[PDB]
Design a protein around this ligand. Structure first.
Ligand SMILES: [Mg+2]
Ligand SMILES: [Zn+2]
Lengths: 48, 168, 49, 49, 225, 346, 96
RNA sequence: CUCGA
DNA sequence: TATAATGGGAGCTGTCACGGATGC
DNA sequence: GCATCCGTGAGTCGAGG
């Protein structure tokens, strides 16, 4: 929604943002026809 | 003759120009609809040579009979296309530019010759400070300007255009 | 994370469009260019390590 | 003999490969559900088991 | 900080002109110059004003550097460095030696120091930085072409800016950008941020990158094939 | 270290004009140009030359270069001759010279004072194929144009008129430089319109549009084929140094064969062809073989007419044509007999 | 690569092996006729299909590439004979 | 990048 | 071609040994 | 005379994509 502070005018709309890849039942993706897997990454945890 | 040695040396501007077959004046590559090299651009057959063996750009000459002949209509030498691997071009700079190898390879060769530190050479080369070539009897803070002196922007402006100020 | 990056780029585009154009006839659709978001996602799923 | 206008640019079995053809897929421009990348008239896929 | 000089007759100097003491300002030579400075002819106030300033030659960039390098007399400097080698302090002998090695390198080679500054930038043959059409009919090209195009654009814009009498800040900026463009062409990443193509973090492959390293020309194409 | 920071500092050195200072400078510039016109009227010289001499004196000896339009090469000698031709004028005439000088000075100061506006505008055109500094410089050119075209009589602020020329310059720059394969500005506008239209269509369709839908949305004169051809012509090249696995592994260029140079096989085939053709030609008399060679271009690289070969051997064109025919006939006979040249026909 | 019908890489270490064997001609062959010598490889193929012995190799193309790329860095690399007189490896094709 | 020696 | 508009905006950083200007 | 910042190397080939 778009709001002008002075006018008080409010315009609202549902906008299309594109697509998001879906994970298959088995935990993988299909990207441009080919099955792919996003491998988990280990890193140093945030903190002090 | 037999190759026995290989020498390497600095190239002078004149040497470079002697290598060149033409100046590249336009940042253009090829034409967007003909897919042929643009004139005076990075792929120009006028400069670097013909794309096809023994054939000018327009097509007035298409055989080996004409060899060394430079077409008058399109300005392309009738020769082997292989020369597009060998013929150099050049770009004539409006202002001189330092060859970074002789600047950043520490210690700087240029900086060593002129007794300039890396910081000073950087400040001059990338336009952060001026350097004096002829003081012309100038005076800064009482002490007269000595040659090869490092002036800031404020100092140089005060010395070259004078001191002044506006008060509201 | 990549979604967040793409969204940030989209937002920059949004403010950029808010500075321009007619100031009374602006719809969400006019301000939002989705291309950088789609690009970030596509980049993640295609060319991420 | 007049030299022909066109030449052989066919897809052939590479050295050391081959077998039995089990599937073909043909995608043509100007046909339902089909839109290839710009300039591409058609794409053919052959599966060899 | 200026000196005023009123005039009742035709003035001999115009605005901008640089002036030394004992210079003919106006009135056929009656009123002259006291200090060093720049001329501001005030027609309203009817006065020749002189803002105190010298006609210094202080330059910036590879123009200045090239000048100083051209001025160098190698043999004299060699003499002085030899005198510096006779010094007791070990450090001064070290520095003098290090300098004298460069000096004598130039002396013995026959190379001129100023040649370390470029006036004409060479352009590699196009077949070594090709623009080729791939299988699908699309085009692939070397980064060198983009580096060269950056260079040419900045150079041409510089020539136009000089042709149209642009101010100092603008020309300085353009020259700086030109130097950086040459630096990107020869050795991208060596100074400052590496040049990248739009929509990518990948540094463009410069002339230095082509030669050196495990993927460089020597190891990848000459010592093995 | 950071060129942008440095430039913003150098820009920060020059203070922003007040309305009065601005108007004053603009006035001085306008009257300066008028003065150059008057000096052209009096001296009979070229306004351009006079402008260049005045500008030369204002700037200094540091910047004295040849101007493209000038019929005379601008060197300190000539500018001194012209400056002495100007200084040798009567008072009321010599006045315009001072007017002009102060005009140029005001010009410089006006640009330099208005270098910030260019930045404030140019910062909105990033990510379009041109560096920030490049955008700034082009915008600066636009600013110069604005300075030279501005008119203070209309009581409009200089920023208003400058912004237009600055935007014009930046946009022109982007449309002229952003692509490696240069595309004419009008075509660039068409391509960008096509893009905006496709994007609107996808924004309304919840998917990317077909060529057909784009054509529909583009109006009359546009069909699917034209959309496709436009998109095809708009395609930018990819880098040969694009990495395939990682930076230390492979480059796209490594997978591209050279199609130009003849392979060893092709070269050897051509060689064997020449040799076999000479072999076959040796079975003819020297004249018929030579006539064939001249008519097919195996000698001096070009095929002669029947009149040229005929004049070369000293016979009628009909005669030489008949000799060519009998030569060919013998070649066909021998070839049918030995079948040594068939395989080269592909 | 097999897909591009490619050749095996004869790397630095393989070269070292040939050097250690003193197999100078085998090595030079790998360097020239077998890879990147255009006149050399063409003539070698033709000679072999003719049943003749392979000819003497000449300059590898990647060395010409090296020379040109050094020229692009404003360095003048010159092949000289024993009398210190320049020898043109580009056969006049690059000299005006 | 992942795999192999 | 004229309302006025006037200083950017990226930035996670877990190795190692040497030659170097330096610069403490 | 001694700690500090910078630039540079860090196995091979082969395969997939
Ligand atoms: Mg239509
Ligand atoms: Zn021609």
């Amino acid at each position: 929604q778009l709001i002008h502070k002075d006018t008080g005018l409010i315009k609202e709309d549902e906008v299309f943002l594109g697509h998001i890849p879906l994970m298959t039942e088995d935990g993988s993706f299909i990207i441009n026809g080919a099955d792919r897997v996003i491998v988990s990454q280990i890193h140093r945890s945030p903190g002090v | 003759k037999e190759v026995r040695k290989v020498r390497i040396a600095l190239a002078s501007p004149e040497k470079i120009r002697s290598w060149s077959y033409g100046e590249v004046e336009k940042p253009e590559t090829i034409n967007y609809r003909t897919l042929k090299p643009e004139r005076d651009g990075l792929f120009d057959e006028r400069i670097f040579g013909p794309i096809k063996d023994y054939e000018c750009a327009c097509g007035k000459y298409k055989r080996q009979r004409f060899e060394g002949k430079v077409c008058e209509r399109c300005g392309v030498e009738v020769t082997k296309s292989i020369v597009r691997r060998y013929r150099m071009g050049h770009i004539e700079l409006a202002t001189p530019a330092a060859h970074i190898w002789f600047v950043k390879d520490v210690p700087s060769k240029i900086g060593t010759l002129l007794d300039l530190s890396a910081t000073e050479l950087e400040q001059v080369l990338y336009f952060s400070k001026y350097i004096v070539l002829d003081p012309k009897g100038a005076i800064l803070n009482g002490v007269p300007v000595e040659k090869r002196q490092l002036l800031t922007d404020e100092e140089y402006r005060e010395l070259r255009y004078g001191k002044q100020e506006t008060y509201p | 994370d990549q979604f967040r990056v793409g969204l940030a780029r989209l937002a920059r585009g949004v403010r950029e469009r808010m500075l321009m154009g007619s100031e009374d006839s602006l719809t969400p659709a006019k301000l939002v260019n989705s291309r950088p978001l789609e690009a970030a996602i596509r980049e993640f799923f295609s060319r991420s390590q | 003999e007049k030299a022909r206008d066109v030449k052989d640019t066919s897809l052939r079995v590479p050295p050391g490969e081959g077998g039995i053809v089990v599937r073909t897929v043909r995608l043509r421009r100007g046909d339902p559900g089909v839109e290839l990348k710009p300039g591409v008239r058609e794409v053919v896929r052959v599966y060899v088991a | 900080k200026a000196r005023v000089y009123p005039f009742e007759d035709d003035v001999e100097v115009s605005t901008g002109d640089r002036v030394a003491p004992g210079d003919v300002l106006a009135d056929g030579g009656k009123v002259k110059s006291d200090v060093y400075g720049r001329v501001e002819v005030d027609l309203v106030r009817n006065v020749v004003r002189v803002v105190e300033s010298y006609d210094i030659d202080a330059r910036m960039g590879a123009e200045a550097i090239q000048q100083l390098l051209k001025e160098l007399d190698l043999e004299a400097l060699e003499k002085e460095l030899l005198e510096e080698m006779k010094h007791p302090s070990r450090a001064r002998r070290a520095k003098a030696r290090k300098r004298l090695e460069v000096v004598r390198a130039f002396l013995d080679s026959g190379n001129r120091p100023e040649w370390m500054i470029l006036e004409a930038v060479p352009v590699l043959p196009p077949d070594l930085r090709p623009m080729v059409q791939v299988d699908g009919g699309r085009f692939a090209t070397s980064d060198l072409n983009d580096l060269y195009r950056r260079l040419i654009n900045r150079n041409n814009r510089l020539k136009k800016l000089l042709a149209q009498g642009a101010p100092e800040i603008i020309i300085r900026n353009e020259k700086r950008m030109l130097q950086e463009a040459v630096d990107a062409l020869l050795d991208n990443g060596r100074r400052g941020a590496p040049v990248t193509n739009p929509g990518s973090d990948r540094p463009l492959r410069s002339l230095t990158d082509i030669l050196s390293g495990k993927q460089g020309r020597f190891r990848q194409n000459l010592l093995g094939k | 270290s950071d060129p942008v920071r440095q430039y913003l500092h150098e820009i920060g050195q020059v203070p922003l004009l007040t309305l009065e200072e601005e108007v004053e400078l603009a006035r001085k510039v306008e009257e300066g140009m008028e003065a150059i016109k008057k000096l052209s009227e009096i001296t009979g010289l070229d306004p351009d030359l006079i402008r260049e001499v005045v500008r030369a004196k204002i700037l200094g000896s540091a910047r004295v270069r040849h101007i493209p339009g000038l019929k005379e090469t601008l060197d300190p000698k000539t500018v001194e001759e012209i400056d002495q031709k100007l200084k040798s004028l009567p008072k009321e005439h010599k006045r315009y010279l001072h007017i002009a000088r102060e005009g140029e000075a005001a010009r410089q100061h006006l640009i330099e004072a208005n270098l910030r506006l260019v930045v404030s505008i140019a910062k909105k055109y990033t990510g379009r194929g041109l560096s920030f500094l490049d955008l700034i410089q082009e915008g600066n050119q636009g600013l110069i144009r604005a300075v030279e075209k501005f008119e203070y009589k209309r009581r409009f602020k200089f920023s208003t008129y400058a912004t237009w020329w600055i935007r014009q310059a930046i946009n022109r720059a982007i449309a002229d430089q952003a692509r490696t394969i240069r595309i004419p500005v009008h075509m660039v506008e068409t391509i960008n319109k096509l893009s905006r239209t496709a994007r609107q269509l996808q924004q309304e369709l919840g998917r990317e549009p077909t060529y057909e839908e784009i054509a529909e949305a583009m109006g009359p004169g546009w069909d699917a084929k034209r959309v496709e051809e436009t998109l095809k012509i708009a395609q930018e090249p990819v880098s040969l140094e694009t990495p395939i696995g990682d930076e230390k592994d492979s480059f796209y260029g490594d997978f591209i064969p050279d199609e130009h140079l003849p392979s060893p096989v092709d070269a050897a085939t051509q060689s064997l062809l020449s040799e076999e053709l000479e072999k076959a030609l040796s079975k003819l008399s020297e004249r018929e073989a030579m006539v064939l060679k001249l008519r097919k271009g195996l000698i001096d690289g070009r095929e002669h007419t029947l009149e040229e070969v005929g004049a070369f051997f000293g016979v009628t064109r009909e005669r030489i044509r008949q000799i060519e025919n009998k030569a060919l006939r013998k070649l066909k006979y021998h070839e049918s007999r030995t079948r040594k040249l068939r395989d080269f026909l592909d | 690569g097999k897909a591009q019908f490619g050749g095996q890489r004869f790397g630095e270490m393989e070269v070292w092996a040939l050097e250690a064997y003193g197999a100078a001609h085998t090595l030079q062959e790998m360097l020239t006729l077998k890879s990147d010598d255009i006149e050399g490889r063409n003539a070698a193929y033709e000679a072999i299909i003719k049943g003749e012995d392979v000819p003497e190799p000449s300059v590898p193309e990647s060395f010409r590439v090296l020379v040109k790329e050094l020229q692009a860095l404003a360095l003048d690399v010159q092949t000289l004979d024993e009398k210190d007189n320049p020898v043109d490896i580009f056969e006049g094709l690059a000299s005006k």
